[PDB]
Amino acid sequence: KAFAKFPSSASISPNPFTVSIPDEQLDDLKTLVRLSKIAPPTYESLQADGRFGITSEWLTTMREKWLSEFDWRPFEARLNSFPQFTTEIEGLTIHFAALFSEREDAVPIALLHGWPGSFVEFYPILQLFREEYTPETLPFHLVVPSLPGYTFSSGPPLDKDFGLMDNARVVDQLMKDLGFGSGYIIQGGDIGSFVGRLLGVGFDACKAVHLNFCNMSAPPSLSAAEKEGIARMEKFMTDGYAYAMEHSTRPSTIGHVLSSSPIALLAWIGEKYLQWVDKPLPSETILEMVSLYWLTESFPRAIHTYREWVATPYQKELYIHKPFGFSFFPKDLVPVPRSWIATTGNLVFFRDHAEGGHFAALERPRELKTDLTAFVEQVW
Amino acid sequence: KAFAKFPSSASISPNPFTVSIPDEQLDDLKTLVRLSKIAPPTYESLQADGRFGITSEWLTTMREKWLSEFDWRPFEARLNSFPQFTTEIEGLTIHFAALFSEREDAVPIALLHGWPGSFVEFYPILQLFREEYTPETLPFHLVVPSLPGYTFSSGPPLDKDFGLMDNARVVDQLMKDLGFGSGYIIQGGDIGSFVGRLLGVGFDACKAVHLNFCNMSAPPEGPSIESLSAAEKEGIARMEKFMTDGYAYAMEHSTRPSTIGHVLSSSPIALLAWIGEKYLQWVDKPLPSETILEMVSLYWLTESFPRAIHTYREWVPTTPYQKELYIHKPFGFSFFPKDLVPVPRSWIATTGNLVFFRDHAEGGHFAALERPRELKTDLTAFVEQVW
């Protein structure tokens, strides 16, 4: 009960989902955390500024915390605190969390995660809505899908390639399944932003798009603050992008590498949870997200989009003609200015923020929630 | 005993080295191979052509082979079949294999490996020399160092940065210590080529350089791509594909050596996947699976990977080749068509006094392993011409 009732217009039946990881799997994870090896200290791993990636000190400390302090059960209970479901789309099990309104006039919204995130990223925002409204007063339907290849969603297929457009098709079908064929809005960050762009461009039921991320180069006058943002983008694309190039070019190899040991996964993904935020996340949060990826074998399956994600498409064929909104966080990965973003769509809404990094839903949930709400109010 | 006598002009003491990996460490390796997981099958890992990297089938099969077939001891015995030594240079333990001549007129040569190689890559060539000469007749001194950070060499330092010039200085010091201050020749491939270039450019004791690899990009003042033969254009096409589809590993080594060092140190299967991909993709004819397991096990047991990649942050960035890094000394090149970045003769010629060039119809990146006879023959001809 509570926010779990499917809209009357839904053409699918509710199949409630509960996260229940067997003790054996948790025992196995713990054994592999302990028996995984740690690299000998090197000049690079002894750099306190972490300019070469995660330090020996950080990895050692996190390993110890994972073994002695981390408990999966309370996090799992939190996962299960919100309505979750699965439905089958093109032979894929598509997982989603949701808060459904009882209002007939509620605006449907799907909120789309990226890598190395998941549906969990949006739990703080869902919690804010749940605190502030009843099912009778909730102004929106809030759908948080697990994209193909992530966590409790299966896929992508083994027998054919799968890309960004395929991801968009699945999200659009899910929204139609839930009864939102008459119209929905998309909120997207990271890879979810590109999926959101494709929904805005190519799918009629998508009526508007709000993004908190746009990776673009100079479009075919700038303030010092804007130039700083461009400098950060350039550093990310030149010094911070090797992981993405590996995902793009050799997904099978890196998939196997990070599946081999949970310490491998922690190092690779943990680096990004450290570097990509404004204010440091709790170490517990990093362990939760990494453990979630480990236990669902997310990494090797989720990275399929990189070979497409990594010419002026945004100003032409991928221009968002529908109402387009943007939330700018200064410590995001590629903080391009408003004037650049405006060339990529019908930008009718732009929110600037003084603080916050890449994981906006985790770092600045109140700002992202209120920005999104304001955008919907303006355009719907 | 044979070929193990230091030259009379050597200043340092011979400290014979024997590879003797404790049983406990071999047991630890097999435990961690067994404990290691593999990815669930994916579209990418089921591609027979391996265009997305190592396949599920290959990794599964290699893991089983590593557990049920592989024995370190015969390989270790092969390692110990040639003279090996260590010496200390700048506080680093520098390991090297060698065949020393008893001839006073013997030409000193150091042969330089790269990544993910090691001194072992030159063993087939050392074997050919030992089969064909006695210490009394061997025309060359053949020194095969382990570069700082690889296998039985220690380093690089924990308390300061270390780069390509530092590597060059270590190699030059080793050759001087062994008595070759009056002159030596460098043979290099991969990262060793760039070390060799620096030796040719800035070290007086280095008298000539032979390379089988050049990391250069297109020369600004020509010759143009249009001037190249159809075959040479194909080479540029391969080089370009390598630099754009094949180079992500190098970018990770350069930008995030600490992260990737920890990642591959965590599990021997992680190391096998990352390095094995290159032993699969970079060769002409496939190597025996046993060879891949030997090389990966060697890296694992010596914690090579996190230490060896220090050079990438300097090597990846690399008109320097035509100007400041031009080799003015006699410069030779051996071209293998399935190497990573097969730039043509007319491009290589802009980067040094290229007095010697040899093409080959076959062979990939690991020239010393793949085409030892050809590389040995080229080196010998080069020395005869220039020394």
In this structure, the number of other CB atoms found within 10 A of the CB of residue A137 comes to: 11
- Breaks in chain A listed by the residue before each, with C–N > 2.5 Å: 220, 310
CA distance A281 to chain B (A): 19
Closest by Cβ to B53, choosing from A46, A242, A253? A253
Find the closest chain B residue to A243 by CA distance.
B252
- Tell me whether residues B258 and A45 touch, CB distance under 8 A: yes
d(CA B200, CA B194): 10
- Tell me whether residues A250 and B53 touch, CB distance under 8 A: yes
| CA distances in angstroms from B18 to B15, B145, B191, B211, listed in the order given | 10, 15, 26, 30
Residue pair B183/B199 in contact (Cβ under 8 Å)? The answer is no
Instruction: For residue B136, give both structure tokens.
Output: 């009394």
- Tell me whether residues B262 and A31 touch, CB distance under 8 A: no
Dihedral Cα B330, B336, B339, B345, nearest 10 deg: 50
Tell me how long chain B is: 387
CA distance B316 to chain A (A): 12
Q: Best interface-test mutation with B: which of A92, A254, A268 has the largest number of B CBs within 10 A?
A: A254
Tell me how long chain A is: 380
Q: Where are the beta strands (DSSP E) in chain B?
A: 84-89, 92-99, 107-112, 140-145, 184-188, 206-211, 327-335, 352-359
- Tell me whether residues B303 and A271 touch, CB distance under 8 A: no
Q: How many domains does chain B have?
A: 1
Q: Best interface-test mutation with A: which of B34, B46, B51, B260 has the largest number of A CBs within 10 A?
A: B260
CA distance A299 to chain B (A): 9
Q: Which residues contact B177 (CB under 8 A, 6 or more apart)?
A: B10, B11, B12, B87, B89
Please list the residues that pair with B334 across neighbouring strands: B358
- Tell me whether residues B31 and A35 touch, CB distance under 8 A: yes
Closest CA to A380 of A317, A323, A304, A309: A323
Residue pair B306/B79 in contact (Cβ under 8 Å)? The answer is no
Report strand pairing: A92-99 vs A140-145. Answer: antiparallel
| CA distances in angstroms from B345 to A355, B197, B223, B227, B336, listed in the order given | 55, 16, 10, 12, 12
Q: How would you label B16-38 residue by residue, b for 16+ Cβ within 10 Å and e otherwise?
A: ebebebeeeebebbeebbebbbb
Chain B contact set for A297 (CB, 8 A): 39-40
d(CA B212, CA B336): 7
Report strand pairing: B140-145 vs B92-99. Answer: antiparallel
d(CA A276, CA A270): 10
d(CA A230, CA A219): 13
> Catalytic residue among B172, B177, B190, B339, which?
B190
Closest CA to A11 of A168, A182, A137: A182
d(CA B54, CA A246): 13
Angle, vertex CA B9, rays to CA B5 and CA B10, nearest 5: 60
Find the closest chain B residue to A50 by CA distance.
B258
| CA distances in angstroms from A263 to A62, A257, B260, listed in the order given | 9, 11, 11
- Tell me whether residues A46 and B158 touch, CB distance under 8 A: yes
d(CA B260, CA B262): 5
Q: How would you label A80-108 residue by residue, b for 16+ Cβ within 10 Å and e otherwise?
A: eebbbbbbebeebbbbbbbbbbebeebbb
> Is B328 a residue of the active site?
no
d(CA B295, CA B317): 27
> Is A190 a residue of the active site?
yes
Closest CA to A298 of A115, A78, A172: A115
CA distance A150 to chain B (A): 13
Chain B contact set for A245 (CB, 8 A): 247-248, 251-252
Closest CA to A128 of A138, A136, A115, A114: A138
- In the three-class reduction of DSSP (H, G, I as helix; E, B as strand; rest coil), residue B108 is classed as strand
- Tell me whether residues A40 and B303 touch, CB distance under 8 A: yes
Find the closest chain B residue to A31 by CA distance.
B35
Instruction: Write out the residue range of the structural domain in which residue B136 sits.
Output: 1-387
Closest CA to B108 of B202, B195, B181: B181
Instruction: For residue A40, give both structure tokens.
Output: 């000998």
Residue pair A210/A345 in contact (Cβ under 8 Å)? The answer is no
Which helix (H) or strand (E) segment holds residue B237: the answer is helix B230-245
Instruction: For residue B45, give both structure tokens.
Output: 């890992």
Give the single-character DSSP code of B332: E
d(CA A353, CA B36): 44
> Catalytic residue among A123, A243, A273, A306, which?
A306
**Helix axes B289-301 and B268-281, enclosed angle (nearest 10):** 130
CA-atom Rg of chain B in angstroms: 20
- Tell me whether residues A297 and B39 touch, CB distance under 8 A: yes
Dihedral Cα B281, B283, B285, B288, nearest 10 deg: -80
- In the three-class reduction of DSSP (H, G, I as helix; E, B as strand; rest coil), residue A191 is classed as helix
Query: Helices in A178-305 by DSSP H: which ranges?
Result: 191-202, 224-239, 242-249, 251-259, 262-275, 283-295, 298-302
Tokens 């749940």 appear where? A130
Residue type, position B124, single letter: P
Q: What is the DSSP string of B131-168?
A: HH--TTT--EEEEEEPPTTSTTS--S-SSS---HHHHH
CA distance B31 to chain A (A): 9
> Residue B170's domain is classified under what CATH number?
3.40.50.1820
Give the single-character DSSP code of A323: E
- Tell me whether residues A157 and B43 touch, CB distance under 8 A: yes
Which helix (H) or strand (E) segment holds residue A169: the answer is helix A164-177
Instruction: For residue A377, give both structure tokens.
Output: 């109010």
Please list the residues that pair with B143 across neighbouring strands: B98, B110
Residue type, position A236, single letter: F
Q: What is the DSSP string of A229-257?
A: HHHHHHHHHHHS-HHHHHHHH-HHHHHHH
Please give the resolution of this entry in Å, rounded to 1 decimal. 1.5
Closest CA to B280 of B254, B304, B249, B253: B249
Size of interface A-B (CB pairs under 8 A): 208
> Is B365 a residue of the active site?
yes
d(CA A376, CA A256): 42
DSSP-based helix, strand, coil % in chain A, nearest 5: 45, 15, 40
